[PDB]
Design an enzyme around this catalytic site. Structure first.
Site, mmCIF file in Angstrom:
data_model
loop_
_atom_site.group_PDB
_atom_site.id
_atom_site.type_symbol
_atom_site.label_atom_id
_atom_site.label_comp_id
_atom_site.label_asym_id
_atom_site.label_seq_id
_atom_site.Cartn_x
_atom_site.Cartn_y
_atom_site.Cartn_z
ATOM 1 N N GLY A 61 -20.323 25.377 27.539
ATOM 2 C CA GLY A 61 -19.277 24.899 28.213
ATOM 3 C C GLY A 61 -18.103 24.353 27.698
ATOM 4 O O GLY A 61 -17.793 24.758 26.583
ATOM 5 N N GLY B 100 -15.974 20.958 26.798
ATOM 6 C CA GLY B 100 -15.894 19.497 26.682
ATOM 7 C C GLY B 100 -14.835 18.719 26.626
ATOM 8 O O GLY B 100 -13.884 19.460 26.928
ATOM 9 N N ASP C 16 -14.435 5.880 23.717
ATOM 10 C CA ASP C 16 -14.965 6.858 24.929
ATOM 11 C C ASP C 16 -16.388 7.039 24.997
ATOM 12 O O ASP C 16 -16.789 8.294 25.452
ATOM 13 C CB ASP C 16 -13.925 8.141 24.943
ATOM 14 C CG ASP C 16 -14.257 8.962 26.190
ATOM 15 O OD1 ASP C 16 -14.174 8.237 27.307
ATOM 16 O OD2 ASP C 16 -14.384 10.140 26.243
#
Length: 274
Positions: free
Chosen positions: A12, A14, A118
């Site tokens: 995918g 990111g 994060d």
């Protein structure tokens, strides 16, 4: 090196670019490859290779070839969000193990002056009780949800301290317990409201300097605070509530350090897997 990696399978997109898994033909192990989209470094990210700890996803290699940048990481199949979704009945021991492991990894990084900035369930990977391994330490700084963002950032402070990550840990912890985010804001201001609704509106005594932060509003509602006890006090013993409260100090300078969190009586009972 990147021709050392085979069976490269896109997983995918990111934070920074496409994410893949691959086979490292030298070790025959599965690794993760992250393409880092840039344009507006290699020394800086390469320093992250030193972050070698059982609760930190290892940065194995920095590949900068044909003007593209790939990071090769240790691979973990699972992550915390997926895990919590698949395991509604997860034991309190597992939760407390994950929490310890998270704090332990963060403490390791903080001790090396490396901040995450994060943290979220999505970068808490689980390998093998699973071993929790934090992904993406240092990348936010190296390369530039609000649900896990601390109030000092929401209020426009540009100064990221170790305390940022501690806030995120408490939010993640709360979510593990509640199975819903503690502060599910849908905007920076709505996020602050969600936080203040629980913890109260700060003032210059509770958080010296808060009213001088760029996005402080004199008109904020005078939230008294529902209190963490009211919100999730049913889910946590007293010591656990004490620790969480210490991690959710709104003034980052009062927020418990990862080091002190690990030393907290909450983790003195041998009732979790480090």
């Amino acid at each position: 090196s990147i021709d050392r990696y085979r069976r490269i399978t896109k997983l995918g997109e990111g934070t920074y670019g496409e994410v893949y898994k691959a086979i490292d033909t030298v070790t025959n192990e599965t690794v993760a490859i992250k393409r880092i989209r840039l344009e507006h470094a290699i020394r800086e990210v390469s320093l992250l290779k030193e972050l070698q700890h059982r609760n930190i996803i290892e940065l194995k290699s920095v590949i900068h070839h044909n003007h593209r940048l790939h990071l090769i990481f240790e691979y973990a199949e699972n992550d915390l969000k997926k895990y919590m979704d698949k395991n509604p009945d997860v034991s309190m021991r597992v939760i407390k193990s994950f929490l310890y492991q998270l704090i332990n990894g963060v403490n390791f990084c903080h001790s090396r002056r490396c901040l995450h900035r994060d943290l979220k369930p999505q970068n808490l990977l689980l390998s093998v009780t699973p071993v929790l391994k934090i992904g993406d330490f240092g990348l936010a700084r190296a390369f530039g949800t609000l649900w896990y963002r601390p109030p000092e950032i929401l209020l426009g402070s540009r100064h990221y301290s170790t305390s940022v990550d501690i806030w995120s840990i408490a939010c993640i912890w709360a979510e593990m317990l509640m199975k819903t985010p503690l502060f599910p804001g849908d905007s920076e201001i709505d996020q602050l409201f969600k936080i203040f609704e629980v913890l109260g509106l700060p003032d210059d005594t509770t958080w010296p300097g808060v009213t001088a932060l760029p996005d402080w509003k004199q008109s904020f509602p005078k939230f008294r605070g529902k209190t963490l006890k009211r919100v999730l006090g049913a889910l946590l013993d007293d010591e656990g509530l004490d620790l969480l409260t210490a991690m959710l100090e709104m003034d980052p300078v009062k927020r418990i350090s990862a080091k002190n969190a690990l030393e907290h009586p909450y983790f003195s009972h041998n009732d979790f897997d480090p």
